Amino acid sequence: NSAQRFCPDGSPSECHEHADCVLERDGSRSCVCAVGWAGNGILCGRDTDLDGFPDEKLRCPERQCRKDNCVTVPNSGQEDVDRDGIGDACDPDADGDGVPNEKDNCPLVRNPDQRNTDEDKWGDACDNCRSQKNDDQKDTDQDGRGDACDDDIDGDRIRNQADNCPRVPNSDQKDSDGDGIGDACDNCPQKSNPDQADVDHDFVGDACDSDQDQDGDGHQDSRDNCPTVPNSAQEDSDHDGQGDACDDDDDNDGVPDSRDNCRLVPNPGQEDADRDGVGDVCQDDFDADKVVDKIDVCPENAEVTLTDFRAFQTVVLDPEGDAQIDPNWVVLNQGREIVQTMNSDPGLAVGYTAFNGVDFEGTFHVNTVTDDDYAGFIFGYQDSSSFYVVMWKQMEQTYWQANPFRAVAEPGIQLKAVKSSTGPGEQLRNALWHTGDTESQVRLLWKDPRNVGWKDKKSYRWFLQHRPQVGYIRVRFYEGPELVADSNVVLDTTMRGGRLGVFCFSQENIIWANLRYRCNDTIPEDYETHQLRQA
Numbered sequence: 001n002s003a004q005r006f007c008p009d010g011s012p013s014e015c016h017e018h019a020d021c022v023l024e025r026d027g028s029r030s031c032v033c034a035v036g037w038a039g040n041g042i043l044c045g046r047d048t049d050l051d052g053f054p055d056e057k058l059r060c061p062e063r064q065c066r067k068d069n070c071v072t073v074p075n076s077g078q079e080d081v082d083r084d085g086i087g088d089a090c091d092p093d094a095d096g097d098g099v100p101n102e103k104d105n106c107p108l109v110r111n112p113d114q115r116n117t118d119e120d121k122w123g124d125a126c127d128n129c130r131s132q133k134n135d136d137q138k139d140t141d142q143d144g145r146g147d148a149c150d151d152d153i154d155g156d157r158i159r160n161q162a163d164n165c166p167r168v169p170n171s172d173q174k175d176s177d178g179d180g181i182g183d184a185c186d187n188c189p190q191k192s193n194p195d196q197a198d199v200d201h202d203f204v205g206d207a208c209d210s211d212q213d214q215d216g217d218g219h220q221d222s223r224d225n226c227p228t229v230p231n232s233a234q235e236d237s238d239h240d241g242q243g244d245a246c247d248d249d250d251d252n253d254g255v256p257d258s259r260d261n262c263r264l265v266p267n268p269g270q271e272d273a274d275r276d277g278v279g280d281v282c283q284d285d286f287d288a289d290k291v292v293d294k295i296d297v298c299p300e301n302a303e304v305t306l307t308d309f310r311a312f313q314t315v316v317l318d319p320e321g322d323a324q325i326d327p328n329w330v331v332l333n334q335g336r337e338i339v340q341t342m343n344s345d346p347g348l349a350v351g352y353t354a355f356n357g358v359d360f361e362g363t364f365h366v367n368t369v370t371d372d373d374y375a376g377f378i379f380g381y382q383d384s385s386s387f388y389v390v391m392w393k394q395m396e397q398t399y400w401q402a403n404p405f406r407a408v409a410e411p412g413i414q415l416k417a418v419k420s421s422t423g424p425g426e427q428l429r430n431a432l433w434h435t436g437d438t439e440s441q442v443r444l445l446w447k448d449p450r451n452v453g454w455k456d457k458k459s460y461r462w463f464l465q466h467r468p469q470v471g472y473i474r475v476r477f478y479e480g481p482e483l484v485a486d487s488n489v490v491l492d493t494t495m496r497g498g499r500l501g502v503f504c505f506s507q508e509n510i511i512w513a514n515l516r517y518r519c520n521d522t523i524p525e526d527y528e529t530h531q532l533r534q535a
């Protein structure tokens with residue numbers, strides 16, 4: 001029998017049995033349903049597919065109270081085009097136009113006529129390049145004309161053939177070295193590297209690249225706005241050249257941040273609308289990003305703001321190709337849900353924001369009985385040769401390519417460090433498939449002692465904690481409401497910060513739903529416990 005708890009401030013909690021009381025930085029507090037449950041904090045219903053919408057409707061009136069419109073397929077976007085109560089994620093005819101999904105060249109825009117003049121994946125009714133095949137449907141400047149159609153693909157009003165950065169906008173067209181490649185998109189804005197050689201594919205060309213990075217934050221010294229402090233996120237509030245992590249007045253208003261109250265907005269006076277410790281222009285907006293602290297994913301970082309994965313770099317881990325099918329990625333739920341539909345070569349979707357200390361949670365689900373291969377997530381991504389990966393494989397299996405070596409994979413969660421000395425290729429590939437260490441490639445920092453694969457159409461919630469400063473790594477897995485695997489504190493210092501993403505390898509129809517990341521440098525307690533308990 002469980003009883004009513006008190007909030008973190010000691011006031012009596014008034015949350016649901018299956019909700020926690022959290023207090024925000026302004027000493028207000030709110031309830032959140034615990035993993036396996038959904039609603040506001042006060043009403044919690046069971047959440048079967050771990051996606052934030054409950055199996056039954058609830059009496060409160062916020063999105064998360066209305067009944068999940070795909071009870072078992074995770075769909076945090078809750079998308080329902082034809083608004084018929086069946087979610088796109090599990091409605092036989094998503095747009096209700098007669099043509100069932102599998103046979104509909106435009107599954108979400110209605111088009112019984114099924115016209116498709118170029119014969120690419122997409123019907124005319126929803127193809128941003130009518131007479132030009134282009135299944136990936138890239139529209140870099142969000143204009144309507146896909147790239148394959150666009151005479152100004154990046155929308156900077158400079159024509160493509162007359163644009164020295166034909167894809168990265170730059171109306172000033174500055175090329176500060178004449179290599180022909182414009183500053184806005186030259187991997188080397190200082191040195192002529194017309195050929196653009198980038199041997200390691202870290203996106204620093206050769207005439208630039210030093211491969212010197214002493215703090216391990218994934219930034220070249222030559223190019224690290226704060227060389228000795230791991231600061232992968234690279235913030236520099238004032239723009240004064242030196243990043244916050246070493247800078248002594250990150251905003252510049254004369255007050256040292258050693259003793260300042262609006263550390264990130266100019267406030268030379270330390271003046272207030274109230275006496276409470278915080279200042280003024282930064283009251284409930286520490287970083288004045290005009291996004292209130294409570295909702296701000298990186299409450300003291302001006303450019304990051306909201307968990308958002310729709311801007312993502314795509315990495316391919318065996319570029320030669322074995323299947324020569326590339327994973328293909330769909331984002332949904334406003335950048336808070338990723339989906340991968342192919343039975344593909346290895347690959348990573350990786351978001352553009354980087355982090356120091358970070359918390360990252362998602363729901364892993366493989367929406368299909370078919371295959372039994374690998375899915376996972378990525379944190380501390382620095383480049384295609386340096387990152388941390390968590391992968392899981394349904395079925396024990398020896399990889400079919402016996403070259404370059406025999407890679408055998410086991411069921412059951414793996415934590416791996418990837419520091420490849422070769423990069424995307426044959427080696428890294430078998431290295432990633434193999435459950436164990438590969439001499440110049442991968443180290444298996446942790447594996448789940450259960451040795452249990454993921455179940456077909458089942459939904460698991462993951463919670464990562466990374467603290468690059470102290471090399472702290474810790475991952476938890478929940479199946480339904482119950483915790484099922486815990487790595488414990490894994491100390492490892494290979495990439496001291498990086499970017500977040502997802503990984504897949506040979507597995508069609510994975511959903512990563514209800515994705516959340518946030519800034520967190522406050523180091524977990526059981527770190528010093530771990531450190532002390534060397535007795």
Ligand SMILES: *[C@@H]1O[C@H](CO)[C@@H](O[C@@H]2O[C@H](CO)[C@@H](O[C@@H]3O[C@H](CO[C@H]4O[C@H](CO)[C@@H](O)[C@H](O)[C@@H]4O)[C@@H](O)[C@H](O)[C@@H]3O)[C@H](O)[C@H]2NC(C)=O)[C@H](O)[C@H]1NC(C)=O
Binds near residue numbers: 520
């Ligand atoms: C950023 O990271 C910080 C550390 O990793 C996070 O701070 C931690 O916040 C939690 C608050 O939940 C504190 O942990 C404990 O909370 C429990 C809650 O009771 C329930 O859980 C316990 C197991 O702890 C279980 O036994 C019970 O049955 C309950 O179901 C309390 O019982 C404890 O007193 C304890 O406070 C950590 O102490 C706190 N650590 C630190 C170092 O601050 C922080 O919240 C993260 N911030 C984010 C995501 O914004």
Ligand SMILES: [Ca+2]
Binds near residue numbers: 004012013
């Ligand atoms: Ca009470």
Ligand SMILES: [Ca+2]
Binds near residue numbers: 047049070071
């Ligand atoms: Ca649900």
Ligand SMILES: [Ca+2]
Binds near residue numbers: 053072076
């Ligand atoms: Ca659902």
Ligand SMILES: [Ca+2]
Binds near residue numbers: 081083093
């Ligand atoms: Ca529908």
Ligand SMILES: [Ca+2]
Binds near residue numbers: 084092094096
């Ligand atoms: Ca329908």
Ligand SMILES: [Ca+2]
Binds near residue numbers: 098106107
């Ligand atoms: Ca249809």
Ligand SMILES: [Ca+2]
Binds near residue numbers: 104
């Ligand atoms: Ca249609």
Ligand SMILES: [Ca+2]
Binds near residue numbers: 118124130
């Ligand atoms: Ca077409």
Ligand SMILES: [Ca+2]
Binds near residue numbers: 122127129130131
């Ligand atoms: Ca087309």
Ligand SMILES: [Ca+2]
Binds near residue numbers: 138139143146
């Ligand atoms: Ca375009």
Ligand SMILES: [Ca+2]
Binds near residue numbers: 153156157159160
């Ligand atoms: Ca252009």
Ligand SMILES: [Ca+2]
Binds near residue numbers: 141143
């Ligand atoms: Ca355009």
Ligand SMILES: [Ca+2]
Binds near residue numbers: 154163166167
């Ligand atoms: Ca351009």
Ligand SMILES: [Ca+2]
Binds near residue numbers: 175176177180190
């Ligand atoms: Ca240049």
Ligand SMILES: [Ca+2]
Binds near residue numbers: 177181189192194
């Ligand atoms: Ca150059």
